Amino acid sequence: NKLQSQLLSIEKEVEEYKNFRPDDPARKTKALLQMVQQFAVDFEKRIEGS
Amino acid sequence: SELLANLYSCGDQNTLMEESAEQAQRRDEMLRMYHALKEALSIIGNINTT
């Protein structure tokens, strides 16, 4: 059960890490859209209180 | 978190986001109206300037 829990915790991320290729525009653009959405949500959170 | 990765997972990526014909008609209509308005303002400029 210990090992099963550890695998469950790690799997969601190593699922992406195992497919890494440095020359991957798709990853770069997905990261760009994730960073921009995070920034716009944090900003609205601090200003509007939403 | 997953939608853009799925969209990049589609079978044919060279035909994704191909514009319809209506967008192609609207592009030409908007440019035609743009040049028409510019020429009208140039002429009003010539009339007032004399």
3-state SS track over A19-47: CCCCCCHHHHHHHHHHHHHHHHHHHHHHH
Q: How was this structure determined?
A: cryo-EM
How far apart, in Å, are the Cα atoms of B46 and each of B34, B39, B42? 19, 11, 6
Q: Are B16 and A26 in contact (CB under 8 A)?
A: no
Per-residue tokens: B49: 């300037």
Q: Are B32 and B39 in contact (CB under 8 A)?
A: no
Q: Which of A13, A24, A30 to mutate to test the interface with B (most CBs of B within 10 A)?
A: A30
For B17-49, b/e burial (b = at least 16 CB within 10 A) is eeeeeeeeeeeeeeeeeeeeeeeeeeeeeeeee
Give A30's contacts in chain B (Cβ within 8 Å).
4-5, 8
Per-residue tokens: B5: 């990765």
PDB resolution in Å = 3.3
Residues 11-50 of A with CB under 8 A from B: 26, 29-30, 33-34
Supply the DSSP symbol for A27. Answer: H
Q: Which of B2, B6, B8 to mutate to test the interface with A (most CBs of A within 10 A)?
A: B8
Positive or negative torsion for Cα B43, B44, B46, B50: positive
Q: State the SS3 of B1-49.
A: CCHHHHHCCCCCCCCCCCCCHHHHHHHHHHHHHHHHHHHHHHHHHHHHH
